[PDB]
Ligand binder design. Sequence first.
Ligand code: CLA
Ligand code: CLA
Ligand code: CLA
Ligand code: CLA
Ligand SMILES: CC1=C(/C=C/C(C)=C/C=C/C(C)=C\C=C\C=C(C)\C=C\C=C(C)\C=C\C2=C(C)C[C@@H](O)CC2(C)C)C(C)(C)C[C@H](O)C1
Ligand SMILES: CC1=C(/C=C/C(C)=C\C=C\C(C)=C\C=C\C=C(C)\C=C\C=C(C)\C=C\C2=C(C)C[C@@H](O)CC2(C)C)C(C)(C)C[C@H](O)C1
Ligand SMILES: CC1=C(C/C=C(\C)CCC[C@H](C)CCC[C@H](C)CCCC(C)C)C(=O)c2ccccc2C1=O
Ligand code: SF4
Ligand code: SF4
Lengths: 741, 80, 172, 183, 38, 158
Amino acid sequence: KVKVVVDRDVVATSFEKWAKPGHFSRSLAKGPKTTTWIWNLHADAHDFDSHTSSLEEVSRKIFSAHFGQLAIIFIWLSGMYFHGARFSNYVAWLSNPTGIKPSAQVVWPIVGQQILNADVGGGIQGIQITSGLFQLWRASGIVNELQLYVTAIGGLVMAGLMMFAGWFHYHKAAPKLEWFQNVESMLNHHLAGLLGLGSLSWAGHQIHVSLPVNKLLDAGVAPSSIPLPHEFILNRNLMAELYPSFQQGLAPFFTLNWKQYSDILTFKGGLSPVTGGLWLTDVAHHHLAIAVLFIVAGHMYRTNWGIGHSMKQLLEAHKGPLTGEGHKGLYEVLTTSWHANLAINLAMLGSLSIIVAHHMYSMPPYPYLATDYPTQLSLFTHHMWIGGFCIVGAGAHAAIYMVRDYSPTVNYNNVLDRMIRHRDAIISHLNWVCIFLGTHSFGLYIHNDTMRALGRAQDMFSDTAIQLQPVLAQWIQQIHTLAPGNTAVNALATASYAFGADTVTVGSKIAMMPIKLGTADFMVHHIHAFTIHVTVLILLKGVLFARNSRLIPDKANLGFRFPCDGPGRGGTCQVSAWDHVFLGLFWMYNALSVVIFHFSWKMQSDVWGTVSSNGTVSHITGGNFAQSAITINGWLRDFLWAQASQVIQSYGSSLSAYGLMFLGAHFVWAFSLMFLFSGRGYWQELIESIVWAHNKLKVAPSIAPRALSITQGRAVGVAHYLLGGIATTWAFFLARIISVG
Amino acid sequence: AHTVKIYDNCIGCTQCVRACPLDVLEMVPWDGCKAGQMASAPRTEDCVGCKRCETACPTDFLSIRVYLGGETTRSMGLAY
Amino acid sequence: QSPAMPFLSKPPNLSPDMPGYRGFDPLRLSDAFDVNWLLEGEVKNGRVAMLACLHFFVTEYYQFPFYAGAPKLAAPAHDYFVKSGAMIQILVFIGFLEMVLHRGKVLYSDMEWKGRKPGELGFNPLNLPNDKAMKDREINNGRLAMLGFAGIIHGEFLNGKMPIEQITNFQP
Amino acid sequence: QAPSGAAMPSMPFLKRPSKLDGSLPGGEGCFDPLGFTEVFSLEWMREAEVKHCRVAMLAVLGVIAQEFGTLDFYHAQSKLQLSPDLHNQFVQNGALQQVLLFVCAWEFFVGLPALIESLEGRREPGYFGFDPLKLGGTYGSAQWKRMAAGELRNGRLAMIAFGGFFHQQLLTKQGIIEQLTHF
Amino acid sequence: MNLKKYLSTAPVVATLWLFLTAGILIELNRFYPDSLFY
Amino acid sequence: ADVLTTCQQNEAFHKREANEIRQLQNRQSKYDANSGGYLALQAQIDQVHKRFDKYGELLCGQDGLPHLITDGDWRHAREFTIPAILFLYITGWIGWVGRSYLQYTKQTKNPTEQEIILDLPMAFKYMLSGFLWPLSAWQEYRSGKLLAKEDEISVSPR
Ligand code: CLA
Ligand code: CLA
Ligand code: CLA
Ligand code: CLA
Ligand SMILES: CC1=C(/C=C/C(C)=C/C=C/C(C)=C\C=C\C=C(C)\C=C\C=C(C)\C=C\C2=C(C)C[C@@H](O)CC2(C)C)C(C)(C)C[C@H](O)C1
Ligand SMILES: CC1=C(/C=C/C(C)=C\C=C\C(C)=C\C=C\C=C(C)\C=C\C=C(C)\C=C\C2=C(C)C[C@@H](O)CC2(C)C)C(C)(C)C[C@H](O)C1
Ligand SMILES: CC1=C(C/C=C(\C)CCC[C@H](C)CCC[C@H](C)CCCC(C)C)C(=O)c2ccccc2C1=O
Ligand code: SF4
Ligand code: SF4
């Protein structure tokens, strides 16, 4: 039943089609008469289900394209390891993690740009990196440049293998549709094989390499004097000195005397007082426990031996009296539509990136990460953005599913059909919740700005006036503080010092400490609730009305991506599902901008800073969040104005690139408004006059110049808006935190 | 209501009539072109002004033209 | 098939009638550019390099005027006579000759070969025999002079030493 | 017992590769167990093998010749020929810089045109028609095939031999001839 | 011949020509830095 | 002229030279002579001297920065006039050979195909023929080949 079936030598390896731009499309293969064709070529290149009607041929392109993506990721990773090996102060940084700034990019001396080679320490000049690679490599037990070089070479070999495999599984051995539709098998393998064995094999690295290398580093042994990882594997006495359980070997594992591994596998919680990172014995044990969970989980689904669940039977069984046919059809939906799967998978991967952002700052997993404030701020912010983009993508592919792949026959009185049948109730209620949240969240800031401006501080929503205590969040912090020895009896310390208990310092710098929630924190949380509900409104409205509305009863026929259905019916600009995604991007940008600003200011005000010999905490912005973050004026003045000081004063320093990129990003953002605020009708008419001048001088091109399509105008607009807006914050953040952190 | 006009360069291709989602238009006999038929706009009280007809018209310039006029429940496409 | 490189196929646009043909074009520049232009360019670059190789050789004790007393150092010499305003007179005179010899059609787009094979600029005052293997003798001397000149100037840049002194008994 | 159809002569248990028919000079065995020729161009692989053969053979003889005696003006401090120490010296001398130039010149102006000709199918891989002394005979004869088979067998041996040379010198820190004489 | 047609496509020739152009300008500024006048 | 003086004789200009060396030396003080950090910073110090010496001949404002004169005065020809002529020669070349190639493509069977897939031999032919573009352009102008006739160019209704 679960079988490998491929077609052999299915596509000849020829440059013929490389010399035929737009070969993949019947509409484009004929070549350009206008410049619109050039844009269309790029816009359509990866829209595989538009090229062919064959689900098999789409599936095979996807599988092969995926290998292309992994090949590129391997080149990028390889690059990061090679730059570490060749152009970094990593080895020097290992000997002084608190004093030396990580640097793995050196610029060439040309037109004076060598100013960007900063005095980072460790006997090089270069750009200070915020990716946290050094903290990752230190956690992995890498102590020398040979180990980084060999990883970089290994990366290039994996990139090569991914390219071969992509080529091979498209041109030589292309799996049939029935191969791809093995969702039960795929999930067993991905759960037990990818995640389970990934976590098991990584736990292996941690126990055998990371643990011994980091224990000796944390004791203060010179990284050159540390035995190479293989010596811990070869000489068991070496390992037994560090972790005595290694005397008893594997006998305690097979005999279920697992308490013998209490040294290597712990439940300490909290952080190393040395590194300000999670105890690697906690992480090794986490990865062992997760590995088992995943290997067990990947035995759920029926393959070739009778045992296991039919996902079809599971879905169809989950039927109640309020939800019609329940999950009937969804197995067919998810085995016949790539877009349906991409919708779910982007929602979860995006949501995961956001969970990772929160978990990694609060439970700093890498040694010397917590007190590398540039890295902490960068990693949180980065993973927030990746998460946001993925969630908006989920909206796009959910809507593409609704237009292209949805059938009423498959979705007959199932949860999907029933949702469409009360889309008016869903969207009216969510609309209401957005107005309720917006008025009662943003309104509190405006109330406060007004009362403060009128000299009425006693009339404000604040810790010192009308208090809005986040009592439920405060109560949960208390429970998590009281957990160790109580509801987590074997846990020695809290999961996170963010919840309560001690201030962890590395040198003088604060790694983590209790993040106290007051009126300012209550207010910004309701802004986040607000910005997320609106983004959901836009994207969900896009999905539920993708196929039709009362305005456009045949919207599915017009497609996913179309500018409008003309100025009639009062005007139908931006009715398409694509246009909902377009609007969703701005709100995602709005939502996440406020999240990373909340993060930056709260951490600087209330968490990050120095602890003196006396033991008094001095925060970077000295606790100004509680009284400043309850007005918009406080955000403008005490956050943007005050913290922009570093980026705008960066000229003539090693941070001058951030100053330039700050202005460059503002430029690109502003430039975006030209596309967003205008319409192609103006531009096509302007081009007519310019074309006249070229005709006059007999220099008009045969490929007729066209204004961008209405949709491309919007695509260009939002792309420059996001690039400009995000890159501005990037330059602001990095200049700020590299200076003050 | 919107005004829909058909000019004499109509080649009777029927594409405007096929495109109209409100059944505003129909093909009528006519000796003026080889097709032996011309677009007609007898039901412009139902015209929403979407200009799908103009989009469909292959003649240069357009043989069918929609002049957006006074708005009505029907022309605004209102289901309330 | 190529006489010079038998393992490679013959450059199609080249022909044995052309002077100094060995069928030597591994990069296939004769496919990229019109052969008549390349042929004209080859013999010209030759003829210029030929005179350049003699200039450096004859610069020893053969007609030094009352406007002599300048070093043979390539870059310092260039800088001196440009400042003097002698090189600008030579530039316009070479510019004049180029327009006269090619009779206006000087561009790669414009230059034509109506009743003249590439190299035939109609300069034969002594009236020595042309249409024979004499063209191959010009080419071989021109090709050798181009590499020759390259050998002179690079020797002049390396150790700042005289072209003819190098081939006595000296090593770096 | 053996497999059903044509079996690989070199490995009688494995099926014969589709492209390797035993006709090639040094490919009577049809030796391709991992099935590279099944996925990759034979003309490419053959060009690479013969190139490696000729580079390796010069390099193995080079090591032995340089061990026995080096030139005076080349002040060779290291007696280990496949050491970083010696390699680094003759990069800084500009000796390996010079031969890199003419190797790079060959590969770009000869080797790459020659490879492209072979992929088009207008050149036998490794053929530069270089036989001044005529120690091969006429191109395609039984004498030529014996020498072609001889080239690969000598080259394949040198390729492997150079592995032994490098690795043994890296452990012992002794000459290849020095190692043979002293244990 | 098809590979050469590909290498003649707008984006490849633009990339290679602007690479060459950028190289010349970069190399001129390496050897003749800080040229504010002729 | 008090507003502009020769940079050589300008105290603010000398002060800027001293400040830029001091900043580089304050950085250099944290490195140990033979180090790459020292040598890199020393290279920059050497080029600071060479730059300020080079710009000495320019006119300087009270700011101590070189100010360019672009009024046509031949004493400042090197600042604008010569770079201006060079600019127009290069871009006139680019424009001319572009027009030449475009005119070639309109004689071919698929003109649009020759705009996205270049005829490289023909592109090279026109590119290498740009060096006398002002004469070429003059000859096309004189011959009535430069400009299209008003009759033959499409316009919208007035
Ligand atoms: C143990 C079995 C196994 C493993 C490890 C994987 C892993 C993967 N599959 Mg899955 N797959 C499997 C079985 C497995 N598959 C089966 C049985 C089916 C058919 C039912 C599929 C059908 C399938 C499809 C249709 C797709 C995937 C994709 C993927 C990749 C998802 C992206 C990612 O997370 O990159 C993680 C990357 C890495 C961990 C690095 C590369 C790992 C390579 C491929 C080797 C790993 C296994 C190997 C045995 C390791 C040896 C260890 C060594 C020490 C000896 C991932 C590499 C997607 C993809 O991207 O394909 C290219 C994709 O589209 N799989
Ligand atoms: C500051 C800029 C700004 C503001 C204030 C708004 C406001 C709104 N947007 Mg818009 N939006 C914006 C920029 C903005 N947007 C931009 C740039 C875009 C393009 C990407 C959009 C695209 C967009 C989409 C696609 C959607 C929204 C929606 C919303 C509404 C969200 C629900 C809500 O909170 O209503 C309440 C109003 C506010 C929060 C604004 C101020 C409230 C004050 C402080 C309290 C009330 C004051 C009182 C009544 C005043 C009396 C004074 C008077 C007597 C003089 C809200 C009206 C969504 C919506 O309609 O949700 C239902 C929606 O789907 N917007
Ligand atoms: C160094 C490069 C090299 C290359 C490119 C080739 C290429 C070729 N060989 Mg040759 N071969 C080589 C070295 C090489 N060989 C050496 C050193 C020997 C002596 C053992 C041989 C012995 C041999 C025989 C007897 C035959 C061939 C044949 C061939 C042809 C078909 C098989 C093939 O596709 O191999 C592709 C080979 C490679 C891509 C190189 C190997 C790459 C792997 C990944 C290297 C590492 C593997 C592993 C770690 C090695 C150690 C493992 C363990 C044993 C310790 C092809 C032209 C057949 C032929 O038809 O001849 C005309 C044939 O019958 N080879
Ligand atoms: C051979 C190419 C060529 C030539 C000779 C011209 C000439 C002209 N352009 Mg046009 N233009 C071109 C390409 C060209 N353009 C391209 C590709 C675009 C799209 C970006 C434009 C967009 C454009 C606009 C928007 C305007 C002009 C205007 C003008 C006129 C005023 C001068 C000017 O502004 O130029 C400077 C031109 C630009 C800054 C635009 C970009 C020029 C590109 C980069 C040059 C491309 C060269 C080409 C790739 C060479 C390939 C040749 C090779 C294959 C042999 C002049 C008639 C103006 C006008 O109408 O004046 C009356 C005007 O407003 N052009
Ligand atoms: C040739 C050819 C082209 C053809 C372009 C052809 C038709 C151009 C048409 C021009 C029109 C008709 C009138 C031009 C009017 C010229 C103006 C009126 C310039 C006045 C000078 C100022 C006033 C400088 C003053 C000054 C100077 C003197 C000295 C400075 O220092 C001070 C200032 C103050 C700047 C292309 C486009 C195909 C590209 C190809 O590549 C080459
Ligand atoms: C980096 C280094 C440099 C030099 C590095 C460089 C060139 C060294 C490369 C080493 C290679 C050549 C090893 C080769 C590995 C050989 C394998 C392992 C043999 C196959 C496996 C067997 C076993 C199968 C055979 C057989 C089969 C086929 C048939 C059977 O019948 C019999 C057996 C017998 C088994 C410098 C000097 C430039 C300076 C730099 O600073 C440092
Ligand atoms: C500015 C603007 C334009 C005009 C912008 C256009 C037509 C795009 C400009 C094209 C750029 C400049 C690329 C063209 C460059 C050529 C490919 C030549 C390249 C030459 C070398 C660099 C290789 C629109 O068409 C438009 C349409 C709808 C809504 C808003 C707008 C809008 O805001
Ligand atoms: S303004 Fe643009 S998007 Fe809106 S109806 Fe008109 S054509 Fe369509
Ligand atoms: S689409 Fe235009 S040409 Fe065709 S029938 Fe309608 S009005 Fe006439």
